[PDB]
Amino acid sequence: MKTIHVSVVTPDGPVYEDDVEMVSVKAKSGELGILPGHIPLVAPLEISAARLKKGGKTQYIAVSGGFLEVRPDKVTILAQAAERAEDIDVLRAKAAKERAERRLQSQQDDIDFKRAELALKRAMNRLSVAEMK
Amino acid sequence: MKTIHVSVVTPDGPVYEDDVEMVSVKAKSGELGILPGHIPLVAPLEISAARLKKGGKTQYIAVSGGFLEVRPDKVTILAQAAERAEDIDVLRAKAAKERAERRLQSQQDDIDFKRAELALKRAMNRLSVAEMK
Ligand SMILES: Nc1ncnc2c1ncn2[C@@H]1O[C@H](COP(=O)(O)OP(=O)(O)OP(=O)(O)O)[C@@H](O)[C@H]1O
Ligand SMILES: Nc1ncnc2c1ncn2[C@@H]1O[C@H](COP(=O)(O)OP(=O)(O)OP(=O)(O)O)[C@@H](O)[C@H]1O
Numbered sequence: 001m002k003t004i005h006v007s008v009v010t011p012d013g014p015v016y017e018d019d020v021e022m023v024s025v026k027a028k029s030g031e032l033g034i035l036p037g038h039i040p041l042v043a044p045l046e047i048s049a050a051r052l053k054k055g056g057k058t059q060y061i062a063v064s065g066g067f068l069e070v071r072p073d074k075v076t077i078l079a080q081a082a083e084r085a086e087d088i089d090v091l092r093a094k095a096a097k098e099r100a101e102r103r104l105q106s107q108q109d110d111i112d113f114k115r116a117e118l119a120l121k122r123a124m125n126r127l128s129v130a131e132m133k
Numbered sequence: 134m135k136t137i138h139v140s141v142v143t144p145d146g147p148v149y150e151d152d153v154e155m156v157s158v159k160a161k162s163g164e165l166g167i168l169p170g171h172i173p174l175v176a177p178l179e180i181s182a183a184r185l186k187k188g189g190k191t192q193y194i195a196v197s198g199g200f201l202e203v204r205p206d207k208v209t210i211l212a213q214a215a216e217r218a219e220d221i222d223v224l225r226a227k228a229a230k231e232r233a234e235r236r237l238q239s240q241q242d243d244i245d246f247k248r249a250e251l252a253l254k255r256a257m258n259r260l261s262v263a264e265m266k
Contacts (some may be wrong), residue, residue: 009200011161011177028144042209044144067142067200067211078175078200078211103243110236115248 002036006052006075008061008082015082016052016061023075024051025068034070041070047121049129050077060085062129064122081122085133088126097123135169138207139185141194141215148215149185149194156208157184158201165201167208174203180254182262183210193218195262197255214255221263230256 006023008016023034026048045066052059066079100120103111136152157166159181178198185192199212233253236244 009175011198042142042211044142065144065213069202069211076175078202080198080213099243103245106243108241110239110241110244112236112245112249112252115252116245119245119248 003054004034004036004038004075005073006077008050008063008077008079010079010082015079016059016084018052018054018059020052020054020059022051022053023077024053025063025077027068032068034068034075038070038075040072041068043068045077045079047118047125049125049132050082058132060129060132062088062122062126064125083126083129085129088130088133090127090130093123093126093130097127137167137169137171137205139210140207141183141196141210141212143199143212143215148212149192149217151185151187151192153185153187153192155186156210157186158196158210160201167201167203170205171203171208172205174201176201176203178210178212180251180258182258182265183215191265193262193265195221195255195259197258216259216262218262218264218266221259221266223260223263226256226259226263230260 003019005019025032026046027043045063045068047065050061050063062083063079064081069076100116103116134154139153139156141149155166155168159179160176178201180198183194183196195216196212197214202209233249236249
């Protein structure tokens with residue numbers, strides 16, 4: 001029953017490390033299921049959930065974009081921000097969601113849109129992942 | 134004069150690939166000059182210029198943070214955005230700088246200042262690096 005060593009790193013350092021059966025992530029190209037033996041690969045990740053499977057139990061992590069690196073003996077997710085499901089502050093993410101929506105409807109604006117949309121997506125992603133704890 | 138392979142990749146894909154005598158970058162910890170034989174290292178990068186020294190000649194790349202991944206033989210810069218100095222659209226970056234400055238100067242409510250400050254740093258860095266083409 002083979003496993004892959006996975007590490008999730010943010011600019012603050014490692015947030016998660018384990019040996020798991022499968023790592024599923026959303027790359028810019030599509031959903032990827034990384035199993036032991038996967039060829040080496042470096043792919044950009046979208047604001048999405050990473051799903052880490054170990055003996056049927058699945059651990060969810062909100063990844064606010066970053067990069068996936070797959071090597072023979074390791075899988076690394078390098079994320080601009082990452083939170084395990086159980087560590088997401090749901091109130092804060094709801095507040096963030098509503099703030100982005102308010103900006104996006106601003107009209108009276110020096111409001112930046114592209115970044116306001118990304119702010120909304122990071123909040124919705126965190127809320128979706130938190131539902132899984 | 135030993136070399137290290139350098140790769141710079143962004144969510145659009147590779148920006149640069151070559152063998153250089155040294156790569157210098159601004160990590161969260163401070164400036165790093167990476168020579169061949171450097172031990173493994175993952176470090177987050179600041180909004181900065183990467184200086185790639187080759188045959189006396191130096192190539193500059195504007196890097197909008199992301200991560201540095203070092204092995205004795207090869208250095209990967211995984212950037213949220215990166216532009217070789219000669220590829221920087223100066224008119225664009227100046228407009229971004231002035232747009233961010235207008236946003237920052239606004240005493241109006243939820244403009245979102247943190248990411249306005251980051252937008253300004255990115256434009257200033259690009260304008261500075263373009264000068265090094
Ligand atoms: N609601 C959440 N629960 C736990 N930590 C979070 C949450 N939202 C952001 N963080 C953390 O705060 C730091 C900044 O993250 P980021 O810049 O993506 O926040 P943001 O989308 O601007 O949200 P906010 O406006 O709520 O601060 C990162 O360390 C991140 O892991
Ligand atoms: N002035 C520049 N010249 C060439 N490409 C650039 C420049 N500014 C951003 N880009 C490119 O556009 C894409 C988005 O980059 P980024 O999100 O950092 O832009 P930005 O800071 O929002 O700037 P702008 O407001 O001008 O779009 C990245 O591919 C990047 O390489």
